[PDB]
């Protein structure tokens, strides 16, 4: 389930 | 489901 | 469904 | 439906 | 319907 | 209807 | 109607 | 009507 | 009317 | 009227 | 009137 | 009047 | 008047 | 007047 | 006057 | 005057 | 004068 | 004078 | 003078 | 289970 | 089990 | 009437 | 009348 | 009537 | 009148 | 009058 | 009627 | 009727 | 009927 | 029927 | 039927 | 049937 | 059947 | 069957 | 089968 | 089988 | 098998 | 096997 | 084996 | 072996 | 061996 | 050996 | 009756 | 009956 | 019966 | 029967 | 039977 | 039988 | 048999 | 057999 | 056998 | 054998 | 053998 | 052997 | 050998 | 040898 | 040798 | 040698 | 030598 | 020499 | 020399 | 020289 | 010189 | 025996 | 034996 | 032997 | 021997 | 020997 | 010496 | 010597 | 030797 | 010397 | 030697 | 000298 | 000098 | 030597 | 001088 | 001077 | 001067 | 030498 | 001046 | 002036 | 002026 | 003025 | 004005 | 105005 | 206005 | 307006 | 409006 | 509005 | 609203 | 609301 | 609420 | 020398 | 020298 | 010198 | 000099 | 000088 | 000077 | 001057 | 001036 | 001026 | 001015 | 002004 | 003003 949050981090960093 | 967010990141980075 | 966003990225990058 | 956007990309790149 | 845009691309590239 | 544009391309390329 | 443009192309190429 | 242009092409090529 | 141009072509080729 | 040009061609070829 | 030119051709060929 | 030229052809061929 | 030339042809052929 | 030439032909053939 | 030549032909043939 | 030549022919044939 | 030649013919034929 | 030749013919025929 | 020849003919025929 | 919190930290730091 | 608290510390420090 | 011309020919030949 | 010309021929031949 | 012309020919040839 | 010419011929032949 | 010429012939033959 | 023209030809050739 | 034209040709050639 | 036109050609060529 | 047109061609060429 | 059109071509070319 | 169209082409080119 | 279309092309090009 | 489409192309290009 | 699609491409490009 | 897809690409690009 | 996917990419990019 | 995944990436990026 | 994971990363980033 | 873990990190960060 | 643990740290931090 | 423990500390702090 | 005409001839000659 | 005409000829010649 | 006509000829010539 | 016509010719020529 | 026609020709020419 | 037609020609020409 | 047709031609030309 | 057709041609041309 | 067809051509052209 | 087809062409063109 | 096909082409074009 | 195929092309194009 | 394939191309394009 | 493959390409494209 | 591979590419793309 | 690999890339991309 | 590795990268990325 | 390692990095990242 | 180590770091991180 | 050690740190941390 | 030791500390802590 | 007919002639003339 | 016919002629002429 | 026929002619003409 | 036929002609003409 | 046929012609024409 | 033959003629006539 | 034959003629006549 | 055939022609034409 | 042959002709005629 | 064939032609045409 | 042949003709005719 | 040949013609005809 | 063939043609055409 | 050849023609014809 | 060749033609024809 | 060549053509034809 | 083939053509066309 | 070449063409054809 | 070249073409063709 | 080059083309073609 | 170049193209092609 | 360059292209192509 | 450059492209290509 | 630059691109490419 | 820059990109690329 | 900057990026990249 | 800055980042990066 | 600052961070980083 | 300050921290760091 | 101060600490640190 | 082949063509076409 | 090949083409096309 | 190759092309295409 | 290669291309394409 | 290479490309592509 | 390299690229790509 | 390097890139990529 | 380095990058990446 | 260094970075990273 | 150092950092990190 | 030092730190850390 | 010293600390710690 941590995969979801990891992916979310990639979004949140590149914004 | 993380695939959706990963793809979203590619959009958000190249904008 | 991620296919739609992937395709969208190709548009958004080449603009 | 992604086909439409893919095609659109070919237009937008060659302009 | 993507056929229309594909064809359009051939016009737009050879101009 | 794409036939019209295809034909148009042949004109536009050979000009 | 594309016939007209096709024919036109034969003129325009051989000029 | 394309017949007219076709014929015209035969003239224009043999000139 | 294309007959006129066709005939004209025979003249123009044999000159 | 194309008859005139056809005949003319016979002259012009045999000269 | 094409008769005149036709006849003329017979002269011009046998010369 | 073409009769004159026709006759002339008979002369010109048998010479 | 073509009679004159016709007659002339008979002379010219039998010479 | 063609009579003269016709007669002349009879001479010229029998010589 | 053609009579003279006609007569002449009778001489020339029987010689 | 053709009488002279006609008569002459009678001589020339019976010789 | 043709009388002389006519008479001459009678001699020449009966010889 | 043709009388002489006529008479001569009577001699020449009866010989 | 033709009388002489005429007379001569009477001799020559009755011989 | 600590993986979840570790991932959460990456989100919370890059915000 | 201390791993959970260690991870928790990383969250709590970067907030 | 052809009799007249036939007779005439016998004259015109024996002259 | 052909009799007249026939007779005339007998004269014109025996002269 | 051809008889008349035939006869005429015999005259016109023997002249 | 042909009698006169016939008689005349008998003279003109026997001369 | 033919009698006169006939008689004349009898003289002209017997001379 | 061709007889008439045939006869006419015999005249028109022997002239 | 071709006979008439054939005959006519014999005239029209020998003129 | 082709006979008629064939014959016609013989006229129209020898004129 | 092609015979008719063939014949017609012989006329139309020799004119 | 191609015979008809072939024949037609011979006419239409020699005009 | 291609024969028909081939023949047709010979017409349509020589016009 | 390709023969039919090939033939058709020869027409459609020479028009 | 590719023959059919190839032939079709020759038509569709020369129009 | 790729032959079919290749051929199809030649059509679809020249339209 | 890659041949099929390669061919397909040539179609899908030239449309 | 990578050939198949590579080919697939050429399709999926040119659409 | 890395070839397979590399190829897969080219697809998954160009979609 | 690190090659496999490296390749995997290229997929997992471009999704 | 550190190569394996390094590679693993690139995956685990880009997810 | 410290390399192994250093690498391990990069994993354990980016999770 | 202190290197090993130093490295270990980096792990044990970032957990 | 021929006797009568024969006798008549003796008169008509000796006159 | 030919006797009658033969006799008649003797009269008609000696006149 | 030819005798009758032969005899008739002797009359018709000596007239 | 040709004898009759032959005889007839002698009459018809000497007229 | 050709004799009959040959004879007939002698009549038909001497008329 | 050609003799018959040959003879016929002599008639048909001399008419 | 060609003799028959050859002869026939002589008739058919001289008409 | 070509002789027959050759002969036939002479007829068919002179008609 | 080509002789037969060649001959046939002479017929088929002169018709 | 090409001679046969060549000859055939002369027929098939002149029709 | 190419001669055969070349000849065949002349037929197949002139049809 | 390329000659054979070249020749074949001339056939296959003119059809 | 490339000649063979080049020739083959001319066939395969004109079909 | 590249010539062979180049030629091969011309075939493989025009199919 | 790069020429070989370059050529190979032209094949592998146009398929 | 880099030329070889560069060329290789063109193949490996267009597959 | 870096050129070699750079080139190698182009291969290794496009696979 | 840093160029070599930089290049090496491009390989090692794109794998 | 720090350039060398900096470059080395780029390798050692992207592995 | 501190540059060297700073660079060294970047290596020693990213391992 | 404190710079050297400060830098050294960064190494000695991150190990 | 001819003596009888000779004598008979003397009677038949003097009647 | 011809003497008999000769004598017979003297009778048959003087009748 | 021809003497017999010669004599016969004198009879057959004077009848 | 031709003498016989020559003599025969004199009979056959004067009939 | 031709003398025989020449003489024969005189018979065969005057019949 | 011709006198002998002339005399001979009188005999051969009056027989 | 002709005197003998002349005398002989008188006998052979008066018989 | 051609004399024989020449003479033969005079027969074969006048028949 | 022609006198001898002329005289001979009278004999060969009156026979 | 051509004289023989020339003469032969005169026969073969007038038949 | 032609006189001799002319005289000879009279003999060779009246035979 | 042509007189000799003309005379010769009369002989070679009347034979 | 071409004279022989030329002459031969005159035969082979008039047959 | 052409007179000689003209005369020669009459001989070479009437032979 | 062409007169000489024209005359020559008559000879070379009538041979 | 073309007259000379025209005349020459008649010879070179009728040979 | 081409004269031979030229002449040969006249034969081979008129057959 | 083209007249000379036109005339020359007739020669070079009819040869 | 193009007339000269046109004429030249006829020569260079019919050769 | 293009007329000159057009004419030139006919020469340079028919050569 | 493009007419000149168009014409030039025909030359430079047909060469 | 583009017409000039279009025409120029045809030359520069067909060269 | 882009027409000029488009045309220019055709030249600069086909060179 | 982008049309101008698009066209320019084709030139700057095909150079 | 971005169209202008997009077009500009194609130029600045293909250069 | 970001479209303008996106486009600008493509230029500033491909330069 | 962050879209503008995101786009700006791409420029400021790729520079 | 933090989105604006996040975006700003990317700019202020990549500068 | 702490999100704003967290974001702010990233800016104030990467500056 | 301590979250706000914790976040504030990160700012006030990284400044 | 091209004359030989030119002539050869006239044969090979008219066969 | 190109003349030889040009001529050769006329042969090789008309076969 | 290009003329040679141009001509060669005309051969190599029409084969 | 490019003319040589241009021409060479026409050969190498039409093979 | 680029013209040489441009031309060279046309060869190297059509092979 | 870049023109040279641009052209060179067209070669190096189409090989 | 960057144009040179840009062009160079097109070469160095397509190799 | 940065343009030079930007362009240089395109080279140095595609090698 | 930072533009220069930014560009420089793109080089120094892609090496 | 901090922009310069920021940019400098991007260089100094990617080396 | 602290911005300068902040930026400086990014350099001094990444060295 | 403490901001300056805070920033200074970040430098002085990371050295």
Numbering used by the authors:
A (entry chain XA), B (entry chain PA), C (entry chain HA), D (entry chain 9), E (entry chain 1), F (entry chain t), ...: 101 to 115
V (entry chain N), W (entry chain P), X (entry chain L), Y (entry chain R), Z (entry chain T), AA (entry chain J), ...: 1 to 15
AQ (entry chain mA), AR (entry chain eA), AS (entry chain WA), AT (entry chain OA), AU (entry chain GA), AV (entry chain 8), ...: 401 to 415
BL (entry chain lA), BM (entry chain dA), BN (entry chain VA), BO (entry chain NA), BP (entry chain FA), BS (entry chain 7), ...: 301 to 315
BQ (entry chain cA), BR (entry chain kA), BT (entry chain UA), BV (entry chain MA), BW (entry chain EA), BY (entry chain 6), ...: 201 to 215
Quote the paper.
Here we report seven high-resolution cryo-EM structures of filamentous peptide nanotubes based on a cross-α supramolecular architecture that provide insight into the designability of helical peptide filaments. A structural interaction is identified based on an appropriately placed pair of arginine residues (RxxxR) within the corresponding peptide sequences. This local interaction motif, designated as an arginine clasp, is robust within the context of these cross-α assemblies and can guide the coalescence of helical protofilaments into structurally defined cross-α nanotubes. In contrast to most structurally characterized filaments based on synthetic α-helical coiled-coils, the chain axes of the helical protomers are oriented in a plane nearly perpendicular to the long axis of the assembly.
